[PDB]
Amino acid sequence: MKFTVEREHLLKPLQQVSPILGNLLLQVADGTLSLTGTDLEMEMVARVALVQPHEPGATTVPARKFFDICRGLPEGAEIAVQLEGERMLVRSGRSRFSLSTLPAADFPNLDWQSEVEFTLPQATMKRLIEATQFSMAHQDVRYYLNGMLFETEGEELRTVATDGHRLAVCSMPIGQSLPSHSVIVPRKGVIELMRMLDGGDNPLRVQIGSNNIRAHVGDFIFTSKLVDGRFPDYRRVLPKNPDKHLEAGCDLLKQAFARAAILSNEKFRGVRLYVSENQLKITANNPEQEEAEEILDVTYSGAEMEIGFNVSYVLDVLNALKCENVRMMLTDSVSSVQIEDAASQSAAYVVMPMRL
Amino acid sequence: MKFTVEREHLLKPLQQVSGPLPTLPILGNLLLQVADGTLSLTGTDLEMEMVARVALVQPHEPGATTVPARKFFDICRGLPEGAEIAVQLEGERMLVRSGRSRFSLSTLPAADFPNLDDWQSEVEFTLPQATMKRLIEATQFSMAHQDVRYYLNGMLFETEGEELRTVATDGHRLAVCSMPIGQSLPSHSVIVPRKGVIELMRMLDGGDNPLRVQIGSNNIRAHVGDFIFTSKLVDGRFPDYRRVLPKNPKHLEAGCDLLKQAFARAAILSNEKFRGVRLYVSENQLKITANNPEQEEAEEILDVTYSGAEMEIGFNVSYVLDVLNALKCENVRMMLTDSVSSVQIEDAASQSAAYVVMPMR
Ligand SMILES: O=[N+]([O-])c1ccc2cn[nH]c2c1
Ligand SMILES: [Ca+2]
Ligand SMILES: [Ca+2]
Ligand SMILES: [Ca+2]
Ligand SMILES: [Cl-]
Ligand SMILES: [Cl-]
Ligand SMILES: [Cl-]
Ligand SMILES: [Cl-]
Numbered sequence A: 001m002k003f004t005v006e007r008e009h010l011l012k013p014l015q016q017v018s019p020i021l022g023n024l025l026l027q028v029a030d031g032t033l034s035l036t037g038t039d040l041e042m043e044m045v046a047r048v049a050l051v052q053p054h055e056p057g058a059t060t061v062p063a064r065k066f067f068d069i070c071r072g073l074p075e076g077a078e079i080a081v082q083l084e085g086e087r088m089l090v091r092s093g094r095s096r097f098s099l100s101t102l103p104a105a106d107f108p109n110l111d112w113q114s115e116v117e118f119t120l121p122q123a124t125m126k127r128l129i130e131a132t133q134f135s136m137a138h139q140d141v142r143y144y145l146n147g148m149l150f151e152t153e154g155e156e157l158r159t160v161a162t163d164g165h166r167l168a169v170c171s172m173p174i175g176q177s178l179p180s181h182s183v184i185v186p187r188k189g190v191i192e193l194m195r196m197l198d199g200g201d202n203p204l205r206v207q208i209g210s211n212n213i214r215a216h217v218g219d220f221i222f223t224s225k226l227v228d229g230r231f232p233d234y235r236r237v238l239p240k241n242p243d244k245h246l247e248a249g250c251d252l253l254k255q256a257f258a259r260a261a262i263l264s265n266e267k268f269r270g271v272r273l274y275v276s277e278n279q280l281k282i283t284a285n286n287p288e289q290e291e292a293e294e295i296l297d298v299t300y301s302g303a304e305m306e307i308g309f310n311v312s313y314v315l316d317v318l319n320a321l322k323c324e325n326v327r328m329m330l331t332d333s334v335s336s337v338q339i340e341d342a343a344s345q346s347a348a349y350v351v352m353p354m355r356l
Numbered sequence B: 001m002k003f004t005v006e007r008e009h010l011l012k013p014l015q016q017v018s019g020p021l022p023t024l025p026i027l028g029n030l031l032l033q034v035a036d037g038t039l040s041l042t043g044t045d046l047e048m049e050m051v052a053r054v055a056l057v058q059p060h061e062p063g064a065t066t067v068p069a070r071k072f073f074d075i076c077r078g079l080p081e082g083a084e085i086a087v088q089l090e091g092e093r094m095l096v097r098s099g100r101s102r103f104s105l106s107t108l109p110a111a112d113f114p115n116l117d118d119w120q121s122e123v124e125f126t127l128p129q130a131t132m133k134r135l136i137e138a139t140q141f142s143m144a145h146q147d148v149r150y151y152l153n154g155m156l157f158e159t160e161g162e163e164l165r166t167v168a169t170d171g172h173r174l175a176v177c178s179m180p181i182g183q184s185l186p187s188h189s190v191i192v193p194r195k196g197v198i199e200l201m202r203m204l205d206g207g208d209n210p211l212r213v214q215i216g217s218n219n220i221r222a223h224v225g226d227f228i229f230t231s232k233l234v235d236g237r238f239p240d241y242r243r244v245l246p247k248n249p250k251h252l253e254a255g256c257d258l259l260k261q262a263f264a265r266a267a268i269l270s271n272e273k274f275r276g277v278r279l280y281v282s283e284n285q286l287k288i289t290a291n292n293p294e295q296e297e298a299e300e301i302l303d304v305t306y307s308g309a310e311m312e313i314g315f316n317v318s319y320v321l322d323v324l325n326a327l328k329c330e331n332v333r334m335m336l337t338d339s340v341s342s343v344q345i346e347d348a349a350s351q352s353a354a355y356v357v358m359p360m361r
Helices: A007-017 A063-072 A122-135 A187-197 A250-261 A311-321 B007-017 B069-078 B129-142 B194-202 B256-267 B317-327
Strands: A002-006 A023-029 A032-038 A042-049 A057-062 A078-084 A087-092 A095-100 A116-121 A147-153 A156-162 A164-174 A182-188 A203-208 A211-219 A219-224 A242-247 A268-274 A279-287 A292-297 A300-302 A305-310 A327-329 A338-342 A347-351 B001-005 B029-036 B038-044 B048-055 B063-068 B083-090 B093-097 B101-106 B121-125 B154-171 B171-194 B211-217 B219-224 B227-232 B251-255 B275-280 B285-291 B297-303 B311-316 B331-335 B343-347 B350-359
Touching: A002 A007, A007 A032, A007 A042, A007 A078, A023 A063, A057 A063, A057 A095, A057 B297, A063 B154, A063 B256, A087 A187, A095 B256, A116 A122, A116 B154, A122 A156, A122 A164, A122 A187, A122 A203, A122 A311, A147 A187, A147 B069, A147 B343, A164 A311, A164 B211, A182 A187, A182 A219, A203 B129, A219 B093, A242 A250, A250 A268, A250 A279, A250 A292, A250 A327, A250 B069, A250 B101, A279 A338, A300 B001, A305 B311, A311 A338, A311 A347, B001 B007, B007 B038, B007 B048, B007 B083, B029 B069, B048 B194, B063 B069, B063 B101, B069 B101, B121 B154, B129 B154, B129 B171, B129 B194, B129 B211, B129 B317, B129 B350, B171 B194, B194 B227, B251 B256, B256 B275, B256 B285, B256 B297, B256 B331, B275 B317, B285 B343, B311 B317, B317 B343, B317 B350
Parallel strands: none
Antiparallel strands: A002 A078, A023 A032, A023 A057, A032 A042, A042 A219, A078 A087, A087 A095, A095 B297, A116 A203, A147 A156, A147 A182, A156 A164, A164 A347, A203 A211, A211 A219, A242 A300, A242 A327, A268 A279, A268 A305, A279 A292, A292 B101, A327 A338, A338 A347, B001 B083, B029 B038, B029 B063, B038 B048, B048 B227, B083 B093, B093 B101, B121 B211, B154 B171, B171 B350, B211 B219, B219 B227, B251 B331, B275 B285, B275 B311, B285 B297, B331 B343, B343 B350
16 A cells, blocks of 8 residues: 655545544545544545555554644645555655554444435534534433434424423525434534534535434545434424513623623522513522622513523523524523524524522 | 722733632632722732732722632623723622622621731842743743642742843753843842742733832742732752753754754654653764654654764653743754763754753663
């Protein structure tokens, strides 16, 4: 196995693909160098064209060491690789390296069949994930909440994320008629998928199987296993009939929350909201008996009520909305609230109240 | 005690005096004092203090208290730009109001705030901020971290003739830097504690305001703009850099960045713990090799200026990298003796900073 390639062409591929699971699989075949990283749950494959003389073959090498070497070489560098027994030789200028190898044959492979396919701007996928990813659970015993629902319905792709205390849902049109379908992508997979998307205008092809998802953009192919379990139905989480409607400036609301939070309990940070005619009062207190109060002029209709919220849950929403004005739809002091950008119904958020 | 101050006049003073910040509650508080038209803010860790003076152009009333530093800073920072911050002491609480935002903070008496003893300066001088930044940045990285030999956890500041000098070492490597001050000074040699060196750096804004320094037998003080920093000194006897510099060290000269990157790349395949690289010096060439127990090998060859006998010497590549990163110059001189002796390293263009790294077996 031999190739010579510009450092420049290896950088993004290496970034994307970065004991045998600490190794990258390198394969030369049909004028192409393919680089594959895997943790057994997911895999990333990047391809680089080879124009300079090359010889087919494959090995695996330490991923971080190999990446660090290539990134460590100067800009403009040319990188020459040859496989020599149990070692891989890497050469550029008067820099030389010999890396240990494990056989290509020992490298783990994820086959499976595609059931649902569609193309969409990578930008639309980014929007969907950014809108909801912060509401994923992290290490819940309910594994299926440690990730994100991808659902196709009509001509929309929808994401849903929840940790049982707050929920996020976002839908975007993809311009073609789709079968009704839903799968859970593990949180690590959502993160890796998001990292593959750079905000250029670039089509993304998505293929979904019974147990896998695959995404192709440019010269990259990401494949992950799915998480198998029953995801909650966002439609049963949305408040069925909120009759109290609050509208306020996004930034004013965010900053009032953040300031009041300073004097909340540091271990479980929440604030009390009192809504009344034209007005919102946010309050906090702590074990030192310190107290914060914020008063805001707001658009409000409905009965006066008091309700508490976890600060981080509300700030997380306001930070995802990046809105001018936000709508909060309330029911009563013991029910969850629905939060939305006053000027967009692409996304919605539902947050449990907190007792204080 | 009462004052009203615009948000942005309070923000950097609060950030600065919080520098030394907890073991007991009052140590997480700032001292606020209104007196003779000035708000003073003080934070301390019992070893050092940072004090800020902020002038009061709005109505105020004298008095003093202490309040939690982080809460008070976070409140001020979180208020809208140009927010007028009104403060009033009310016994065991201090009330903060701006627009329709209100905060109540728990106080501890100003009289219980620890207060560094009065002391007498024996030497005083002024110097540009840029000079102090250069002295500290040149040597800070070589200070020990949590060593049982406490005096090594600090930085030696030495005045001698027309020069201010810093020295730092952890027993394994040493850094020394001297700069002119255009003023004759008595001989003093003092150890500044770890966090004090950090505070000194932190107060240098990078404008044209000079730095005024005062040193006594047991204390050091630095004034910049409207900030006064004071630290107690570490009460030990620091090693003498003069006696650690190699007696008579073969001369190698090389581009700093070419050297840095070659060491950086070789280090990738150096032992994970011991970080050993081998240097082979030969006629106008340096060869750097690293290998680990996996028997992966790195080799970098560089063109350098060298005329001496060929030799092999091992180094902790991290120590060498630290030196090259602190030098930030075009060319470096490495001054060698033999394979079991330290190397001295310097900017090829200046003897103001010198570095001593011991070889590894
Ligand atoms: O009541 N809620 O706001 C709420 C939020 C998230 C989840 C997830 N499963 N059930 C939920 C209910
Ligand atoms: Ca992977
Ligand atoms: Ca190139
Ligand atoms: Ca103002
Ligand atoms: Cl290519
Ligand atoms: Cl080699
Ligand atoms: Cl939706
Ligand atoms: Cl593809």
